PDB file of C-alpha atoms in Angstrom:
ATOM      1  CA  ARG A   1     -76.713  63.662 -29.349  1.00 52.84           C
ATOM      2  CA  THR A   2     -80.475  64.198 -28.976  1.00 50.78           C
ATOM      3  CA  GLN A   3     -82.923  65.907 -31.333  1.00 49.03           C
ATOM      4  CA  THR A   4     -85.627  67.022 -28.909  1.00 52.73           C
ATOM      5  CA  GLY A   5     -88.253  68.264 -31.356  1.00 54.67           C
ATOM      6  CA  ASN A   6     -87.900  65.483 -33.916  1.00 54.69           C
ATOM      7  CA  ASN A   7     -89.989  62.322 -33.685  1.00 58.04           C
ATOM      8  CA  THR A   8     -86.936  60.084 -34.203  1.00 58.89           C
ATOM      9  CA  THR A   9     -83.476  60.657 -32.724  1.00 57.01           C
ATOM     10  CA  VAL A  10     -80.165  59.466 -34.184  1.00 51.42           C
ATOM     11  CA  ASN A  11     -77.054  59.384 -31.989  1.00 50.26           C
ATOM     12  CA  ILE A  12     -74.272  60.850 -34.121  1.00 47.50           C
ATOM     13  CA  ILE A  13     -71.988  60.617 -31.076  1.00 51.14           C
ATOM     14  CA  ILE A  14     -72.403  56.824 -31.085  1.00 50.48           C
ATOM     15  CA  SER A  15     -72.183  56.520 -34.872  1.00 48.96           C
ATOM     16  CA  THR A  16     -68.823  58.329 -34.831  1.00 49.93           C
ATOM     17  CA  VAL A  17     -67.360  55.993 -32.193  1.00 48.04           C
ATOM     18  CA  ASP A  18     -68.695  52.994 -34.125  1.00 48.86           C
ATOM     19  CA  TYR A  19     -66.791  54.187 -37.194  1.00 50.40           C
ATOM     20  CA  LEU A  20     -63.723  54.762 -35.015  1.00 52.73           C
ATOM     21  CA  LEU A  21     -63.965  51.183 -33.743  1.00 49.67           C
ATOM     22  CA  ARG A  22     -64.198  49.891 -37.318  1.00 50.53           C
ATOM     23  CA  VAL A  23     -61.198  51.890 -38.550  1.00 51.78           C
ATOM     24  CA  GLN A  24     -59.108  50.882 -35.532  1.00 53.06           C
ATOM     25  CA  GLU A  25     -59.819  47.215 -36.285  1.00 49.46           C
ATOM     26  CA  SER A  26     -58.788  47.799 -39.900  1.00 49.57           C
ATOM     27  CA  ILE A  27     -55.521  49.416 -38.779  1.00 55.76           C
ATOM     28  CA  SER A  28     -54.860  46.583 -36.320  1.00 55.04           C
ATOM     29  CA  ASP A  29     -55.384  43.959 -39.031  1.00 55.20           C
ATOM     30  CA  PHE A  30     -53.129  45.831 -41.458  1.00 55.07           C
ATOM     31  CA  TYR A  31     -50.440  46.013 -38.767  1.00 55.07           C
ATOM     32  CA  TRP A  32     -50.787  42.292 -38.072  1.00 56.74           C
ATOM     33  CA  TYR A  33     -50.203  41.763 -41.789  1.00 55.77           C
ATOM     34  CA  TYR A  34     -47.118  44.013 -41.698  1.00 54.32           C
ATOM     35  CA  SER A  35     -45.786  42.544 -38.426  1.00 54.50           C
ATOM     36  CA  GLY A  36     -43.667  39.585 -39.530  1.00 56.57           C
ATOM     37  CA  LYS A  37     -42.282  41.290 -42.630  1.00 56.56           C
ATOM     38  CA  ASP A  38     -39.075  43.199 -41.942  1.00 57.14           C
ATOM     39  CA  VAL A  39     -39.619  46.288 -44.118  1.00 54.29           C
ATOM     40  CA  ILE A  40     -42.839  48.094 -45.028  1.00 54.27           C
ATOM     41  CA  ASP A  41     -43.189  48.879 -48.721  1.00 51.45           C
ATOM     42  CA  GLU A  42     -44.269  52.241 -50.121  1.00 55.50           C
ATOM     43  CA  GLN A  43     -47.875  51.176 -50.764  1.00 54.91           C
ATOM     44  CA  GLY A  44     -48.261  49.897 -47.211  1.00 58.05           C
ATOM     45  CA  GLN A  45     -46.603  53.010 -45.783  1.00 58.91           C
ATOM     46  CA  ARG A  46     -49.025  55.223 -47.751  1.00 60.61           C
ATOM     47  CA  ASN A  47     -52.062  53.188 -46.683  1.00 62.46           C
ATOM     48  CA  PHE A  48     -50.913  53.592 -43.075  1.00 61.75           C
ATOM     49  CA  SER A  49     -50.646  57.345 -43.636  1.00 64.75           C
ATOM     50  CA  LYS A  50     -54.170  57.612 -45.045  1.00 63.47           C
ATOM     51  CA  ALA A  51     -55.680  55.450 -42.281  1.00 59.88           C
ATOM     52  CA  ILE A  52     -53.847  57.460 -39.607  1.00 60.16           C
ATOM     53  CA  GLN A  53     -55.196  60.673 -41.144  1.00 58.55           C
ATOM     54  CA  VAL A  54     -58.745  59.293 -41.016  1.00 58.32           C
ATOM     55  CA  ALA A  55     -58.339  58.131 -37.408  1.00 59.43           C
ATOM     56  CA  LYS A  56     -56.841  61.494 -36.427  1.00 60.20           C
ATOM     57  CA  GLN A  57     -59.799  63.341 -37.930  1.00 59.33           C
ATOM     58  CA  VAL A  58     -62.272  61.076 -36.120  1.00 62.71           C
ATOM     59  CA  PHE A  59     -60.436  61.633 -32.822  1.00 64.20           C
ATOM     60  CA  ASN A  60     -60.513  65.400 -33.373  1.00 67.46           C
ATOM     61  CA  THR A  61     -64.248  65.236 -34.084  1.00 68.69           C
ATOM     62  CA  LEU A  62     -64.824  63.277 -30.871  1.00 67.75           C
ATOM     63  CA  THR A  63     -62.758  65.652 -28.739  1.00 69.90           C
ATOM     64  CA  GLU A  64     -64.667  68.578 -30.250  1.00 65.28           C
ATOM     65  CA  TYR A  65     -67.838  66.737 -29.238  1.00 62.15           C
ATOM     66  CA  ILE A  66     -66.710  66.305 -25.631  1.00 61.00           C
ATOM     67  CA  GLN A  67     -65.234  69.715 -24.800  1.00 60.37           C
ATOM     68  CA  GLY A  68     -67.104  72.526 -23.092  1.00 62.12           C
ATOM     69  CA  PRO A  69     -67.887  69.892 -20.461  1.00 62.09           C
ATOM     70  CA  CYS A  70     -70.736  68.418 -22.508  1.00 62.05           C
ATOM     71  CA  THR A  71     -71.991  66.047 -19.823  1.00 60.20           C
ATOM     72  CA  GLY A  72     -74.402  64.178 -22.081  1.00 58.90           C
ATOM     73  CA  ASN A  73     -71.780  63.491 -24.734  1.00 55.96           C
ATOM     74  CA  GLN A  74     -69.265  62.472 -22.071  1.00 56.23           C
ATOM     75  CA  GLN A  75     -71.666  59.981 -20.485  1.00 54.93           C
ATOM     76  CA  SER A  76     -72.759  58.556 -23.844  1.00 53.99           C
ATOM     77  CA  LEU A  77     -69.172  57.994 -24.979  1.00 55.99           C
ATOM     78  CA  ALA A  78     -68.307  56.557 -21.561  1.00 57.03           C
ATOM     79  CA  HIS A  79     -71.059  53.961 -21.980  1.00 56.33           C
ATOM     80  CA  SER A  80     -70.223  53.448 -25.675  1.00 55.38           C
ATOM     81  CA  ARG A  81     -67.605  51.145 -27.229  1.00 55.99           C
ATOM     82  CA  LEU A  82     -64.815  53.750 -27.228  1.00 56.48           C
ATOM     83  CA  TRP A  83     -62.704  51.801 -24.729  1.00 60.92           C
ATOM     84  CA  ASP A  84     -62.236  48.893 -27.158  1.00 61.08           C
ATOM     85  CA  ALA A  85     -60.912  51.283 -29.803  1.00 61.01           C
ATOM     86  CA  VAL A  86     -58.603  52.881 -27.236  1.00 58.15           C
ATOM     87  CA  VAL A  87     -57.232  49.523 -26.063  1.00 59.87           C
ATOM     88  CA  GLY A  88     -56.646  48.500 -29.677  1.00 62.77           C
ATOM     89  CA  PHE A  89     -54.779  51.697 -30.488  1.00 61.88           C
ATOM     90  CA  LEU A  90     -52.716  51.203 -27.331  1.00 62.25           C
ATOM     91  CA  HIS A  91     -51.467  47.814 -28.555  1.00 59.37           C
ATOM     92  CA  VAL A  92     -50.763  49.131 -32.055  1.00 57.48           C
ATOM     93  CA  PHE A  93     -48.857  52.130 -30.690  1.00 55.60           C
ATOM     94  CA  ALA A  94     -46.879  50.076 -28.172  1.00 52.72           C
ATOM     95  CA  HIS A  95     -45.656  47.656 -30.823  1.00 53.09           C
ATOM     96  CA  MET A  96     -45.015  50.027 -33.750  1.00 52.93           C
ATOM     97  CA  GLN A  97     -43.182  52.269 -31.283  1.00 55.36           C
ATOM     98  CA  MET A  98     -40.694  49.438 -30.901  1.00 54.48           C
ATOM     99  CA  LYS A  99     -40.721  48.455 -34.561  1.00 53.31           C
ATOM    100  CA  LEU A 100     -40.549  51.603 -36.706  1.00 52.34           C
ATOM    101  CA  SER A 101     -37.901  53.240 -34.513  1.00 55.01           C
ATOM    102  CA  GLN A 102     -35.215  50.700 -35.432  1.00 55.39           C
ATOM    103  CA  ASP A 103     -35.620  51.378 -39.166  1.00 58.81           C
ATOM    104  CA  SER A 104     -34.456  54.748 -40.493  1.00 58.98           C
ATOM    105  CA  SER A 105     -36.809  54.686 -43.505  1.00 59.77           C
ATOM    106  CA  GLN A 106     -40.037  55.070 -41.475  1.00 59.99           C
ATOM    107  CA  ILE A 107     -39.456  58.454 -39.807  1.00 55.95           C
ATOM    108  CA  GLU A 108     -42.511  60.053 -41.426  1.00 56.62           C
ATOM    109  CA  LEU A 109     -44.735  57.114 -40.469  1.00 59.73           C
ATOM    110  CA  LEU A 110     -43.396  57.285 -36.915  1.00 56.88           C
ATOM    111  CA  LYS A 111     -44.230  60.997 -36.727  1.00 52.30           C
ATOM    112  CA  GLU A 112     -47.761  60.343 -37.999  1.00 54.37           C
ATOM    113  CA  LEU A 113     -48.252  57.582 -35.432  1.00 53.94           C
ATOM    114  CA  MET A 114     -46.923  59.712 -32.549  1.00 51.93           C
ATOM    115  CA  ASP A 115     -49.282  62.524 -33.586  1.00 53.82           C
ATOM    116  CA  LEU A 116     -52.194  60.077 -33.595  1.00 52.48           C
ATOM    117  CA  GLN A 117     -51.145  59.010 -30.092  1.00 50.51           C
ATOM    118  CA  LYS A 118     -51.101  62.643 -28.975  1.00 52.06           C
ATOM    119  CA  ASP A 119     -54.619  63.197 -30.304  1.00 49.33           C
ATOM    120  CA  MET A 120     -55.901  60.027 -28.618  1.00 51.35           C
ATOM    121  CA  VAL A 121     -54.427  61.148 -25.288  1.00 51.14           C
ATOM    122  CA  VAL A 122     -55.951  64.612 -25.781  1.00 51.82           C
ATOM    123  CA  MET A 123     -59.400  63.074 -26.282  1.00 55.33           C
ATOM    124  CA  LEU A 124     -58.819  60.927 -23.193  1.00 59.02           C
ATOM    125  CA  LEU A 125     -57.991  64.096 -21.249  1.00 60.56           C
ATOM    126  CA  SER A 126     -61.159  65.787 -22.523  1.00 61.08           C
ATOM    127  CA  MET A 127     -63.026  62.656 -21.388  1.00 61.93           C
ATOM    128  CA  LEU A 128     -62.211  63.582 -17.768  1.00 64.30           C
ATOM    129  CA  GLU A 129     -62.831  67.336 -17.950  1.00 66.16           C
ATOM    130  CA  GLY A 130     -64.972  68.405 -15.014  1.00 64.80           C
ATOM    131  CA  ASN A 131     -64.516  65.028 -13.337  1.00 66.47           C
ATOM    132  CA  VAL A 132     -65.939  64.207  -9.916  1.00 72.15           C
ATOM    133  CA  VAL A 133     -64.391  62.117  -7.162  1.00 70.59           C
ATOM    134  CA  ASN A 134     -65.117  58.420  -7.753  1.00 68.22           C
ATOM    135  CA  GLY A 135     -66.722  59.032 -11.124  1.00 68.12           C
ATOM    136  CA  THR A 136     -68.035  56.443 -13.545  1.00 68.09           C
ATOM    137  CA  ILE A 137     -65.859  57.813 -16.361  1.00 66.36           C
ATOM    138  CA  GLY A 138     -62.783  57.532 -14.158  1.00 70.51           C
ATOM    139  CA  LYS A 139     -63.683  53.982 -13.159  1.00 69.26           C
ATOM    140  CA  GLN A 140     -64.165  52.914 -16.781  1.00 67.32           C
ATOM    141  CA  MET A 141     -60.879  54.556 -17.777  1.00 64.23           C
ATOM    142  CA  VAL A 142     -59.055  52.732 -14.978  1.00 64.69           C
ATOM    143  CA  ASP A 143     -60.618  49.466 -16.156  1.00 62.59           C
ATOM    144  CA  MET A 144     -59.496  50.197 -19.729  1.00 63.16           C
ATOM    145  CA  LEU A 145     -55.945  50.944 -18.582  1.00 60.08           C
ATOM    146  CA  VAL A 146     -55.867  47.771 -16.470  1.00 61.61           C
ATOM    147  CA  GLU A 147     -56.970  45.806 -19.532  1.00 65.20           C
ATOM    148  CA  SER A 148     -54.179  47.483 -21.535  1.00 65.60           C
ATOM    149  CA  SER A 149     -51.624  47.210 -18.704  1.00 64.49           C
ATOM    150  CA  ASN A 150     -48.707  45.755 -20.682  1.00 65.13           C
ATOM    151  CA  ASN A 151     -48.987  48.150 -23.628  1.00 66.27           C
ATOM    152  CA  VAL A 152     -48.964  51.136 -21.268  1.00 64.67           C
ATOM    153  CA  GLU A 153     -45.891  49.691 -19.531  1.00 67.54           C
ATOM    154  CA  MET A 154     -43.983  49.408 -22.811  1.00 67.95           C
ATOM    155  CA  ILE A 155     -45.067  52.898 -23.909  1.00 65.62           C
ATOM    156  CA  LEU A 156     -43.942  54.364 -20.576  1.00 67.80           C
ATOM    157  CA  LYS A 157     -40.581  52.565 -20.724  1.00 72.37           C
ATOM    158  CA  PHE A 158     -40.054  53.827 -24.280  1.00 69.94           C
ATOM    159  CA  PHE A 159     -40.839  57.367 -23.141  1.00 68.67           C
ATOM    160  CA  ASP A 160     -38.430  57.225 -20.186  1.00 68.54           C
ATOM    161  CA  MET A 161     -35.594  55.689 -22.230  1.00 68.96           C
ATOM    162  CA  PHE A 162     -35.701  58.772 -24.479  1.00 68.68           C
ATOM    163  CA  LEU A 163     -36.451  61.370 -21.800  1.00 71.31           C
ATOM    164  CA  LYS A 164     -33.178  60.395 -20.123  1.00 71.44           C
ATOM    165  CA  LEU A 165     -31.444  60.923 -23.485  1.00 72.51           C
ATOM    166  CA  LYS A 166     -31.519  64.710 -23.111  1.00 74.16           C
ATOM    167  CA  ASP A 167     -29.859  64.488 -19.692  1.00 75.75           C
ATOM    168  CA  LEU A 168     -27.254  62.103 -21.114  1.00 76.08           C
ATOM    169  CA  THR A 169     -26.457  64.353 -24.082  1.00 76.50           C
ATOM    170  CA  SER A 170     -26.318  67.475 -21.879  1.00 76.68           C
ATOM    171  CA  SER A 171     -24.148  65.790 -19.229  1.00 75.26           C
ATOM    172  CA  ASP A 172     -20.465  66.678 -18.946  1.00 73.46           C
ATOM    173  CA  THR A 173     -19.467  63.020 -19.328  1.00 73.59           C
ATOM    174  CA  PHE A 174     -20.780  63.357 -22.886  1.00 73.64           C
ATOM    175  CA  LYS A 175     -18.975  66.691 -23.340  1.00 73.65           C
ATOM    176  CA  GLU A 176     -15.612  65.113 -22.488  1.00 74.96           C
ATOM    177  CA  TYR A 177     -16.288  62.360 -25.028  1.00 74.84           C
ATOM    178  CA  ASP A 178     -17.132  65.104 -27.562  1.00 73.67           C
ATOM    179  CA  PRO A 179     -15.098  68.198 -26.599  1.00 73.08           C
ATOM    180  CA  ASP A 180     -15.936  69.791 -29.966  1.00 72.35           C
ATOM    181  CA  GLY A 181     -19.176  71.566 -30.830  1.00 68.81           C
ATOM    182  CA  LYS A 182     -19.644  69.798 -34.171  1.00 69.03           C
ATOM    183  CA  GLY A 183     -22.191  67.502 -32.523  1.00 68.37           C
ATOM    184  CA  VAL A 184     -21.382  64.477 -34.699  1.00 71.05           C
ATOM    185  CA  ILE A 185     -20.202  61.843 -32.228  1.00 70.42           C
ATOM    186  CA  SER A 186     -18.756  58.556 -33.439  1.00 68.94           C
ATOM    187  CA  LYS A 187     -20.810  55.396 -32.948  1.00 67.59           C
ATOM    188  CA  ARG A 188     -17.983  53.896 -30.871  1.00 62.43           C
ATOM    189  CA  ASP A 189     -17.752  56.862 -28.496  1.00 62.15           C
ATOM    190  CA  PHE A 190     -21.545  56.977 -28.241  1.00 57.74           C
ATOM    191  CA  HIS A 191     -21.581  53.415 -26.909  1.00 54.54           C
ATOM    192  CA  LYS A 192     -18.818  54.358 -24.485  1.00 56.75           C
ATOM    193  CA  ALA A 193     -21.085  57.243 -23.422  1.00 57.32           C
ATOM    194  CA  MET A 194     -23.979  54.895 -22.690  1.00 55.66           C
ATOM    195  CA  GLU A 195     -21.614  52.668 -20.700  1.00 55.59           C
ATOM    196  CA  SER A 196     -20.222  55.574 -18.658  1.00 55.98           C
ATOM    197  CA  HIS A 197     -23.680  57.031 -17.983  1.00 55.35           C
ATOM    198  CA  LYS A 198     -24.585  53.869 -15.988  1.00 55.42           C
ATOM    199  CA  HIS A 199     -28.184  55.100 -15.953  1.00 59.22           C
ATOM    200  CA  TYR A 200     -28.940  52.849 -18.950  1.00 63.73           C
ATOM    201  CA  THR A 201     -29.080  49.076 -18.748  1.00 62.79           C
ATOM    202  CA  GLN A 202     -27.499  46.848 -21.381  1.00 62.65           C
ATOM    203  CA  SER A 203     -30.808  46.248 -23.167  1.00 62.81           C
ATOM    204  CA  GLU A 204     -31.642  49.960 -23.317  1.00 64.24           C
ATOM    205  CA  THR A 205     -28.115  50.748 -24.520  1.00 65.41           C
ATOM    206  CA  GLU A 206     -28.212  48.170 -27.311  1.00 64.68           C
ATOM    207  CA  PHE A 207     -31.715  49.221 -28.369  1.00 63.27           C
ATOM    208  CA  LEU A 208     -30.706  52.892 -28.543  1.00 63.33           C
ATOM    209  CA  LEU A 209     -27.584  51.991 -30.528  1.00 60.55           C
ATOM    210  CA  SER A 210     -29.715  49.934 -32.926  1.00 61.34           C
ATOM    211  CA  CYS A 211     -32.225  52.785 -33.306  1.00 62.47           C
ATOM    212  CA  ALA A 212     -29.346  55.165 -34.115  1.00 60.98           C
ATOM    213  CA  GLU A 213     -28.703  55.679 -37.823  1.00 61.60           C
ATOM    214  CA  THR A 214     -25.067  56.045 -38.877  1.00 65.65           C
ATOM    215  CA  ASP A 215     -23.537  57.008 -42.213  1.00 68.45           C
ATOM    216  CA  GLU A 216     -20.595  55.440 -44.033  1.00 69.98           C
ATOM    217  CA  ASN A 217     -18.344  57.567 -41.803  1.00 72.08           C
ATOM    218  CA  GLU A 218     -19.453  55.417 -38.820  1.00 72.94           C
ATOM    219  CA  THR A 219     -20.540  58.639 -37.097  1.00 74.09           C
ATOM    220  CA  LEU A 220     -23.977  59.881 -36.046  1.00 72.79           C
ATOM    221  CA  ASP A 221     -25.387  63.316 -35.235  1.00 73.83           C
ATOM    222  CA  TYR A 222     -26.548  62.958 -31.636  1.00 75.46           C
ATOM    223  CA  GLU A 223     -28.091  66.419 -31.956  1.00 75.67           C
ATOM    224  CA  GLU A 224     -30.420  65.183 -34.702  1.00 76.59           C
ATOM    225  CA  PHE A 225     -30.947  61.883 -32.862  1.00 72.81           C
ATOM    226  CA  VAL A 226     -32.270  63.617 -29.740  1.00 73.61           C
ATOM    227  CA  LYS A 227     -34.031  66.267 -31.841  1.00 74.31           C
ATOM    228  CA  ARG A 228     -35.921  63.403 -33.476  1.00 71.84           C
ATOM    229  CA  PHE A 229     -36.687  61.180 -30.475  1.00 69.47           C
ATOM    230  CA  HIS A 230     -37.125  63.685 -27.635  1.00 68.54           C
ATOM    231  CA  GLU A 231     -39.912  66.188 -28.277  1.00 70.09           C
ATOM    232  CA  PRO A 232     -42.608  63.614 -29.252  1.00 71.03           C
ATOM    233  CA  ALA A 233     -41.791  61.752 -26.052  1.00 66.12           C
ATOM    234  CA  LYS A 234     -41.991  65.003 -24.097  1.00 66.84           C
ATOM    235  CA  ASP A 235     -45.350  66.170 -25.451  1.00 67.97           C
ATOM    236  CA  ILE A 236     -47.087  62.777 -25.345  1.00 66.13           C
ATOM    237  CA  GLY A 237     -45.622  61.893 -21.945  1.00 69.71           C
ATOM    238  CA  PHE A 238     -46.684  65.188 -20.408  1.00 70.86           C
ATOM    239  CA  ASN A 239     -50.292  64.530 -21.419  1.00 67.15           C
ATOM    240  CA  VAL A 240     -50.035  60.937 -20.169  1.00 65.24           C
ATOM    241  CA  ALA A 241     -48.669  62.203 -16.844  1.00 64.92           C
TER     242      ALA A 241
END
C-alpha cells in the first residue's frame, strides 16, 4: 500500500481493484452479448471460463491483501471503486443464475460462476473483519447492497428455492411417491411431489421442473438433481447469511 522509504509511492491495492473493475465490465459486456441468444457456443463458454478464472484470481489476491485485519488496506479498498465491481458482479450472478440453470449443457460454467460468487462473498466477509459499531466500511457496504437490492433479492430467492429442495426430497411425502431406493423418480411423479409439498408456489414448481433434466425414459435422478443444486446454495448462502 505505502512504500515509506521510497520517494514515490504506488498503490498496488488500488491498481488491483482498478483491474478488477475493468475485467468485471468486460464480463458484463460479454454477458450482455450472450443474453438474447438462447444457447452459448463453445468459444463463448471457454471465454467465460478464462475470464472467471482471472476474476477469481484477482478476488483471491484482494482477500489476501485484506486479511490479518490490515486496517490500511481495508480503508483504501473501502474508499476505492470496489463497490462498482461488486454491484456489477451481483447483476451478472443474479441473471446467469436464472439463465444457465435451465440449460443442462452449462453445468461446468454454472459451477465456475458459483465458485466466483463464493470468492466474492469471502472477500466481502474479509472486508468487515474487525469491524466496529457504525463503521464506514459497514455503511458503504449497506449502500452498495441497497444499490444492488433487486439482484440480491433474486439471488436469495434462488438460494431458498433450492435449500427447501433437500427438505422436500427427504420428506416422507416424497418417500411414498418413490417407495424404492433407486432414486430415479419419474418427471410426472416429481411434479405431483411439488404439488403435494404445498411449500412451493406454481412459479417455483414450474421453474424447478424446467431446470430438471430428464432422459428419454422421462425419468430424472432427484438424487443427482439435489446433489447438483444444493451444496453450492448451502455454502454461498451460509457466507451471505
